[PDB]
């Protein structure tokens, strides 16, 4: 029984091995703890928004949407329909990006390196969509607690449709390279098997729950923006191993394509942010023409809007699981407390149980199938 | 509605068993993967010839910060300090006083580019379009000190990039 | 794509599908980089009367 340290995403991992078996797996985290939750307390809500881009930095607009929903619930306002449709469309695009990153990185760690490039070309195209809509490729900060910052450019929808009509073939190529390969199945089948009750008690969410046969999805059971107006299927696993989670993620990519099609065909007209200048800033022309608009712009960009006192816990179906925010307001324009809930935290906490009686090479597969990004884990 | 991903039961008749045995012994799926890689080998790569070719960009895209001025030549900034107040990273430092002609102008306008997050909140908070985040992104530096911009550097950046900055603003100002 | 017919058939047989139907490199089918000006309508609270803020 020898103890060895896999030092430095960035992870320190302490194990004791009995030959090839993994006996204890003690992950050491905090190598990316930047004190985001304490820094948020010194910012206004608009100022605190860009932290959520950096929390789970593979799914940026999903964290933006979760924070915006929490602030909207505390403010007792609602975004316009077009803003909600844009939010859901870009959330599905973000889910596609996140699942591409997760699947290709998991394959790369095992030893399959070519689909990484194949699908990072598509990732670059989606980054182009992000840049066109917001001016930034990755740390977008586009989704706001009143809606979205800017309306879509006049040719974005056509390019999104053009991208979406060719992505299924890329998924097909990935499946041809991975799904029926016997080496991939030997690396993934019956690895990291977790029971439904254990997953529930360990705090798992998302694919980590659905691969064990638990029929749960926050977009279906607790819909938030317009998710009750779109139709899609929830992939369900049967064995609770890495292979079932891989299949579930591929199926979620296909269903995200389906939802993107529905969103493109049903984009409504109207404004993009709540028509309430005490929360959402006015237009530039109004600010440069009307006295009230200039006053409200000044106050919103210097002090920010005040949020009525209260505490809420708002969760969404993030591409990695249930992403939640426990937001506390004291009545001022700065949040009193902001606790950030990341599914990767619970998944990494369960990594120890998931790796009992497995090879040293299986822990890498379990880490890859858990979809761990340490920005959200450490915060 | 929900879907099953791994709920297929293999057939147990002699033909399907023989097919699976042939797959196991003759390595059919590995040949399929080899064929997929071979098919990718014969298509045009997605590589562009940097730096001679450039990646597509948009007017909205945020680049290096610049201080603009009116067509008459006077700087637009009036030292309202709204960008400094809104800056989520506290990257902007501003000091001001009345000018020799009594105008409200800055004497210090510093942006720490190693603290900036390039969010663009400052340019959307500015009421006179004085501070903008221009399209330049190739401004890497050999030392930390040259990334600490003062007012002279930002005014020089504005005078250097004004043509493209104004074109981008003309393209994008109807969405703001 | 500027690919010869023989290479086209070879890659089609190797992958087992029709690739020219769905190409992964953009071409003239994308939108123009210069676009007409938009209009961006206003919200429901842009009325000149019966629009007191206390009711919204």
């Amino acid at each position: 029984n020898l103890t060895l340290n896999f030092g430095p995403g960035v992870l320190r991992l302490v194990m004791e091995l009995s030959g090839e078996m993994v006996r204890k797996c003690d992950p050491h985290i905090g190598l990316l703890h930047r004190g985001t939750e304490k820094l948020i307390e010194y910012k206004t809500y608009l100022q605190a928004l860009p932290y959520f881009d950096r929390l789970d930095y593979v799914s940026m607009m999903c964290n933006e949407q979760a924070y915006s929903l929490a602030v909207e619930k505390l403010l007792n306002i609602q975004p316009p329909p077009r803003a909600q449709w844009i939010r859901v469309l870009f959330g599905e695009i973000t889910r596609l990006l996140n699942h591409i990153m997760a699947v290709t990185t998991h394959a790369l760690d095992i030893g399959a390196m070519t689909p990484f490039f194949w699908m990072f070309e598509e990732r670059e195209k989606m980054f182009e969509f992000y840049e066109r809509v917001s001016g930034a490729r990755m740390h977008a900060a586009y989704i706001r607690p009143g809606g979205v910052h800017q309306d879509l450019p006049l040719g974005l929808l056509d390019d999104i449709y053009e991208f979406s009509k060719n992505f299924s073939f890329r998924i097909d190529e990935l499946e041809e390279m991975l799904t029926n390969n016997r080496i991939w199945r030997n690396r993934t089948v019956d690895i990291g098997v977790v029971t439904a009750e254990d997953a529930l008690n360990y705090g798992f969410s998302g694919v980590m729950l659905r691969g064990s046969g638990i029929q749960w999805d926050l977009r279906k059971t607790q819909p938030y923006d317009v998710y009750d107006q779109v139709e899609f299927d929830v992939p369900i696993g049967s064995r609770g191993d890495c292979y079932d989670r891989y299949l579930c993620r591929v199926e979620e990519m296909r269903q995200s394509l389906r939802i993107i099609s529905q969103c493109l065909n049903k984009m409504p007209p109207g404004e993009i942010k709540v028509d309430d200048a005490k929360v959402s800033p006015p237009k530039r022309a109004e600010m440069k023409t009307s006295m009230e608009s200039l006053i409200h712009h000044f106050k919103l960009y210097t002090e920010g809007y005040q949020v009525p006192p209260g505490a809420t816990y708002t969760a969404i179906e993030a591409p990695k699981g249930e992403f939640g925010v426990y937001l506390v307001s004291d009545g001022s324009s700065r949040p009193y407390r902001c606790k950030i809930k990341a599914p990767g935290f619970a998944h990494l906490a369960g990594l120890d149980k998931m790796s009992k009686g497995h090879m040293l090479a299986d822990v890498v597969a379990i880490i890859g199938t858990q979809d761990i990004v340490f920005g959200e884990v450490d915060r | 509605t929900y879907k099953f991903v791994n709920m297929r039961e293999p057939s147990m008749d002699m033909k399907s068993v023989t097919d699976r045995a042939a797959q196991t012994l003759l390595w059919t799926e590995l040949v399929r993967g080899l064929g997929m890689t071979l098919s990718y080998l014969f298509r045009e790569p997605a590589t562009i010839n940097y730096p001679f070719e450039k990646g597509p960009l948009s007017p909205r895209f945020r680049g290096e910060h610049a201080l603009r001025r009116y067509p008459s030549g006077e700087e637009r900034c009036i030292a309202c300090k709204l960008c400094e107040a809104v800056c989520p990273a506290q990257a902007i430092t501003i000091e001001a006083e009345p000018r020799a002609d009594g105008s409200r102008r800055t004497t210090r306008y510093d942006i720490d580019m190693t603290k900036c997050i390039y969010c663009g909140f400052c340019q959307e908070a500015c009421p006179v379009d004085a501070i903008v985040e221009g399209p330049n992104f190739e401004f890497s530096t050999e030392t930390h000190e040259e990334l600490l911009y003062n007012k002279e550097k930002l005014l020089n950046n504005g005078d250097k990039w004004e043509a493209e900055i104004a074109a981008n603003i003309q393209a994008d100002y109807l969405y703001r | 794509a500027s690919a010869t017919r023989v290479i086209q058939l070879l890659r089609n047989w190797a992958s087992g599908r029709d690739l020219q139907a769905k190409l992964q490199l953009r071409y003239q089918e994308i939108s123009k980089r210069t676009q007409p000006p938009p209009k961006l309508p206003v919200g429901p609270s842009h009325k000149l009367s019966n629009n007191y803020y206390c009711t919204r």
């Binding site: 879509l152 006049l154 449709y161 009509k165 299924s168 065909n265 984009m267 | - | 087992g16 938009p38």
Partner: peptide, 29 residues
Amino acid sequence: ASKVKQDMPPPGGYGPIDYKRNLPRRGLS
């Protein structure tokens, strides 16, 4: 005078988007 102009789907909507898995069977018994 000028009417509203923003990014909208074309009249009649977009064409269908393929999303189902397509892994064909080549053929050898």
